[PDB]
Amino acid sequence: RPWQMKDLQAIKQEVSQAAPGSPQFMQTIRLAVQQFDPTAKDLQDLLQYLCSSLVASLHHQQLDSLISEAETRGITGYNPLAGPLRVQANNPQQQGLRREYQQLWLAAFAALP
């Protein structure tokens, strides 16, 4: 049950005025992420739709650092012999990795301003 075009259109329109990482944007994006239960691929699509290449790159770097610390510590469900967290989160049998990816994503995007 992935999102459709209308959901993305509403998500972008409702937060057109606000700035990335504002409390309003964080509310709406967090609700979307917690409601649709998407993988990393869909999150990348959503970010490309919402913010430009500059904000995309900044979030990419911040999320790289956050994932770096998180999975360098060691995580309950992460096994580094199978692939990067971006790929484990895309397997529907690793929901723990998917939820960790979602939370790192939202925190990284909130850490912009």
Residue numbers in the entry: 13 to 125
Q: Can you list sentences taken from the study reporting this PDB entry?
A:
The retroviral structural protein Gag forms the immature protein shell of nascent virus particles. All retroviral Gag proteins contain three canonical domains: matrix (MA), capsid (CA), consisting of independently folded N-terminal (CA-NTD) and C-terminal (CA-CTD) domains, and nucleocapsid (NC). During immature virus particle formation, these domains function in membrane binding, viral lattice self-assembly and viral genomic RNA (vgRNA) packaging, respectively. Our results show that HTLV-1 uses a distinct CA-NTD arrangement to form the immature Gag lattice and that, in contrast to other retroviral structures, the CA-NTD is the key determinant of immature HTLV-1 assembly.
To analyze the structure of immature HTLV-1 lattice interfaces in more detail, we engineered an HTLV-1 Gag truncation construct for bacterial expression, purification, in vitro assembly and analysis by cryo-ET. The MA126CANC tubes exhibited varying helical parameters. Tubes were sorted into nine groups and each group was processed separately by subtomogram averaging. The in vitro assembled tubes had the same arrangement of the CA-NTD layer as the full-length HTLV-1 Gag VLPs (Cα root-mean-square deviation (r.m.s.d.) = 1.2 Å), underscoring the biological relevance of our in vitro system. The CA-CTD layer in the tubular arrays was arranged in a similar way as in the VLPs produced from cells, also forming a layer of disconnected dimers. However, in this case, the qualitative difference between CA-NTD and CA-CTD was even more dramatic. The CA-CTD density in different individual tubes did not permit structural analysis other than coarse positioning of the CA-CTD dimer, as the CA-CTD layer was only visible at lower resolution (compare Fig. 2d and Extended Data Fig. 6d). Nevertheless, this allowed us to assess large-scale changes in the CA layer between the different tube geometries. Unlike the CA-NTD layer, the CA-CTD layer was observed to have larger movement of its domains. While the distance between the adjacent symmetry-independent CA-NTD trimers was nearly constant (42.1–42.6 Å), the distance between symmetry-independent CA-CTD dimers was skewed such that it was decreased in the direction of tube curvature (31.8 Å) and increased along the tube axis (35.6 Å).
